[PDB]
Design a protein around this ligand. Structure first.
Ligand SMILES: Cc1cc(/C=C/C#N)cc(C)c1Nc1ccnc(Nc2ccc(C#N)cc2)n1
Lengths: 401, 552
């Protein structure tokens, strides 16, 4: 039995072109796809389907997995999976001592997809050097990566989880795309025991990492505590505070500026006055706390900015309006693009847990460089939206540690 | 014939109805041509006479074929096309020769009447109805509809290719050692068989194609290697671009120059070191196409080098899947990069060039890194593999830049190669303020309604100065002020500015720019021994910022 699905009014299916893939992914994509084909999950299609979405292969272990980039389809069905029937985001999830993330995407393969919607899930397996025609396919069942699949399977999912939720009233279970998030305040051993208990329920229906959101704390703007202060040091100080001045109510600078008097050598040491040492402290305590006056607005996109700090460190902010930070953080420890790819996933994970939403990312890289390399390091079932930016050099240090 | 293959279901765009376009009157002789032709076609099954019911109609007409005495039948499918659904793109992506594998023997087979050999979706035929007009359009015309893929209808290219691919699949499956490429109504077939068995495999394929409605040239009419294709000359064991003759002229029109740049760009796929910078500067501005452009000195010489590189034939080899690809890049000149890709030195599979500015200001290390990226994507397409690179840059240089630059980057496995000019960093900004070096507090400004600017500095040693600038912008004055500090300072100098704009530019260590200012500021930075550059918030009332803010 299928649920009728339609696009948003007016607009047409996705026609997104397939990226070049390496010999190995193409190989793995053929193997995987001929198997899905004889299990009836996909069927070859003819040229009268003009639609396309990109596909590629990841190894998360050594086992190739198919990943379809449904960002466009998702965007073009969005009213459906959000404001018709949709999945509520529990605010208690981010409070749990332990959240475990379990892949349940393999459950969708047992549900028929609305026959008239199938054509929009068209994808192509390319050949190298375009020497032969791509192999085109459609889905027959709920596909992984499409935001409609958990919306539709939701009804079956609550039924499946009902006993376990009934027997453990304090455990929070949240679904987003192909994953379940499961949180409790049990001691880690007993939390795991319960995850296994949960897997056993899942296993009777055809489904076979650990976060500690409780232990997430913001990375304040750090104000140096200099033994001795130079003019250069004090000017940096003022800039950093100047900039914070637009996020945090009550930041003061006027005493410190008074220390910058006349035109001094940059390397001149300067004694910190009674009133200056006082602002320093007052501003630190403010910087320590959350931004007074900033709130998550459910109707607005989340945005996430990342700066390269060098030496393997990366800073980031999540906001809806610039400088109104909902969350700041860092991520640490080779390959620039690998680290960035990992940081994006981490930030997306926290973002899902906190708001039930993925951020639009601003990436400090060249479009071309990112697009060549990121699939080499991707291990996630979703893909966030992203764009590419040149980091304003100042912003970088104001967020440095 | 009409292939026995199943049809592709097709429909009109979701709201629309089929075309209902009035057939205009035709001259008597065009009417005669059309009747003869449609009579031929009808007896082949290509079309069918239709009843009075069919309300749809699409205009038709006839043209005298080339310089012959036969006519062609042309249908105007504009209306039907606008009402027909979109199809999968026929296929977008042409194989590059350098990706092809060496073959012992290759043959071209020509598919006859390709479109008219494939059946049209029965449910759809009604919308292809057309009418041969009676003389003076006095009586009802003769009405027909298509049973096959019409020439000129939106869906024919794509349904044809799909039909061929489907027809070929059994053959490919029973003949994996054999290689076949479909382009439009052509089939090319490669084998590593000797002339004898290859000819035999070609016949089984012809038999297979004919079993499916598709007629082909007899063993006599199949064209010989080497073939011309998509601008290339293919031989079984090597490939090149097809003959390129650069004209001898005293006077070059804009059109002559564009076409010359086009041929040169095309030849650069395999002729190493082709350059077009000097010829391309000529195209600059905006003349008429018939306008004559005298060649500059450095352009007439550029033509010279190119005409030389081309005087002799050069071929590329084919790809051996068993071996690594090696890519080498050299700096030619001014933002111009060239490269070669090979597996055995120095038998190139192909060459190329890169010449793009990303932004107004960059340096050789950015540009090199971008060429690497451009070549990497290209390799993925052509070979499905990244090459190993050999780059005119020291590992130390690139590691210095990458680490302290704020953008993320990564290039695949590479190693140093000493092919000058070597790419290097031409100056490094200090990381800490300098002791014993004058501190210049600079500042520039501009009144938006006047275009007037002042640019200046005060220093901790009491030096001062302001210069007036006209027609300038805020951005320019901020750069002038830093330029001033650089001219008047000694070999070591600290510079304090409130321009994030200026800081961004310079902190990116540019070594060339579209701005004359920035090029001078750069020339200046090369001369210094140590420069430290610092930023401060403007108008926040800072000790030194306030001072020179009062002067400008
Ligand atoms: C893409 C392609 C274009 C032509 C285009 C033909 C034309 N005109 C002919 C063929 C047979 C193919 N297909 C493939 C696939 C793999 N290796 C090769 N090698 C290969 C092909 C032609 C010659 C020659 N001469 C040498 C090697 N060809």
């Amino acid at each position: 039995e299928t649920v009728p699905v339609k696009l948003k009014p007016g607009m047409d299916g996705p026609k997104v072109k397939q990226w070049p893939l390496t010999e190995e992914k193409i190989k793995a994509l053929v193997e995987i796809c001929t198997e899905m084909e004889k299990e009836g999950k996909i069927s070859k299609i003819g040229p009268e389907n003009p639609y396309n979405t990109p596909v590629f292969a990841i190894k998360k272990s050594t086992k190739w997995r198919k990943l379809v980039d449904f960002r466009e389809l998702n965007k073009r069905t969005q009213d459906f999976w959000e404001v018709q029937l949709g999945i509520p985001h529990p605010a208690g999830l981010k409070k749990k001592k332990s959240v475990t993330v379990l892949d349940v995407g393999d459950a969708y393969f047992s549900v028929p997809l609305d026959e008239d919607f199938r054509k929009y899930t068209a994808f192509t397996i390319p050949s190298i050097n375009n020497e032969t025609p791509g192999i085109r396919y459609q889905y027959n069942v709920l596909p992984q990566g499409w935001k409609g699949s958990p919306a539709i399977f939701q009804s079956s999912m609550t039924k499946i989880l009902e006993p376990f939720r009934k027997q453990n009233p304090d455990i929070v279970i949240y679904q987003y795309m192909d994953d379940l998030y499961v949180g409790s305040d049990l001691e880690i051993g007993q939390h795991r025991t319960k995850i296994e208990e949960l897997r056993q329920h899942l296993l009777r229906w055809g489904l076979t990492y650990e976060l500690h959101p409780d232990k997430w704390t913001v990375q304040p703007i750090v104000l140096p505590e200099k033994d001795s202060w130079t003019v250069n040091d004090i000017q940096k100080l003022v800039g950093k505070l100047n900039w914070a001045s637009q996020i945090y109510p009550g930041i003061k600078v006027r005493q410190l500026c008074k220390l910058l008097r006349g035109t001094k050598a940059l390397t001149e040491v300067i004694p910190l006055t009674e009133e200056a040492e006082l602002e320093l402290a007052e501003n630190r305590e403010i910087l320590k706390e959350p931004v007074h006056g900033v709130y998550y607005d459910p109707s607005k996109d989340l945005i996430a900015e990342i700066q390269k700090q060098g030496q393997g460190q990366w800073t980031y902010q999540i906001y809806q309006e610039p400088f109104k930070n909902l969350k700041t953080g860092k991520y640490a420890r080779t390959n620039d693009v690998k680290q960035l790819t990992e940081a994006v996933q981490k930030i997306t994970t926290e973002s899902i847990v906190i708001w039930g939403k993925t951020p639009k990312f601003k990436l400090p890289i060249q479009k071309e460089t990112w697009e060549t390399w990121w699939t080499e390091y991707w291990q996630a079932t979703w893909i966030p939206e992203w764009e590419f930016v040149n980091t304003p050099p100042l912003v970088k240090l104001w967020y440095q540690l | 014939p009409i292939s026995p293959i199943e049809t592709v279901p097709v429909k009109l765009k979701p709201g629309m109805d089929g075309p209902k376009v009035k057939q205009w009157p035709l001259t008597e002789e065009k009417i005669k041509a059309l009747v003869e032709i449609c009579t031929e076609m009808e007896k082949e099954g290509k079309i069918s006479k239709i009843g009075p019911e069919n309300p749809y109609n699409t205009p038709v007409f006839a043209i005298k074929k080339k310089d012959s005495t036969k006519w062609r039948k042309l249908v105007d499918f504009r209306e039907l096309n606008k009402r027909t659904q979109d199809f999968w793109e026929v296929q977008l992506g042409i194989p590059h020769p350098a990706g092809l594998k060496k073959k012992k023997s290759v043959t071209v087979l020509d598919v006859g009447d390709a479109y008219f050999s494939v059946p049209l979706d029965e449910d759809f035929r009604k919308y292809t109805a057309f009418t041969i007009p009676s003389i003076n359009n006095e009586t009802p015309g003769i009405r027909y509809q298509y049973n096959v893929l019409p020439q000129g209808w939106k869906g024919s290219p794509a349904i044809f290719q799909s039909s061929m691919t489907k027809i070929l699949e059994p053959f490919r499956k029973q003949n994996p050692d054999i290689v076949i490429y479909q382009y439009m109504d052509d089939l090319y077939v490669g084998s590593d068989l000797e002339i004898g068995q290859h000819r035999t495999k070609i016949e089984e394929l012809r038999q297979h194609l004919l079993r499916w409605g598709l007629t082909t040239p007899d063993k006599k009419h199949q064209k010989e290697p080497p073939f011309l294709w998509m601008g290339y000359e293919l031989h079984p064991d090597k490939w090149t671009v097809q003959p390129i003759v650069l004209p001898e002229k005293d006077s070059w029109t804009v059109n002559d120059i564009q076409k010359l740049v086009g041929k040169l760009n095309w030849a650069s796929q395999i002729y190493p070191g082709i350059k077009v910078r000097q010829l391309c500067k000529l195209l600059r501005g905006t003349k008429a196409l018939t306008e004559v452009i005298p060649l500059t000195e450095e352009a007439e010489l550029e033509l010279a080098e190119n005409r030389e590189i081309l005087k002799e034939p050069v071929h590329g080899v084919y790809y051996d899947p068993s071996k690594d690809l090696i890519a080498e890049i050299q700096k030619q000149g001014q933002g111009q990069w060239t490269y070669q890709i090979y597996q055995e030195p120095f038998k190139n599979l192909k060459t190329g060039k890169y010449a793009r500015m990303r932004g107004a200001h960059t340096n050789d290390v950015k540009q090199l890194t971008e060429a690497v990226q451009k070549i990497t994507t290209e390799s993925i397409v052509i070979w499905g593999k990244t090459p190993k690179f050999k780059l005119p840059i020291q590992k130390e240089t690139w590691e210095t830049w990458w680490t302290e630059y704020w953008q993320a980057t990564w290039i695949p496995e590479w190693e140093f190669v000493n092919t000058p000019p070597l790419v290097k960093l031409w100056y490094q900004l200090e990381k800490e303020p300098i002791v014993g070096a004058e501190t210049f507090y600079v500042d520039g400004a501009a009144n938006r309604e006047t275009k007037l600017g002042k640019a200046g500095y005060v220093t901790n040693r009491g030096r001062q100065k302001v210069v007036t600038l006209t027609d300038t912008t805020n951005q320019k004055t901020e750069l002038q002020a830093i330029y001033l500090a650089l001219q008047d300072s000694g070999l070591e100098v600290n510079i304090v500015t409130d321009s994030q704009y200026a800081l961004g530019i310079i902190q990116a260590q540019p070594d060339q720019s579209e701005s004359e200012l920035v090029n001078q500021i750069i020339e200046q930075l090369i001369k210094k021994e140590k420069v430290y550059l610092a930023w401060v918030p403007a108008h926040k009332g800072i000790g030194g910022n306030e001072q020179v803010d009062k002067l400008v």
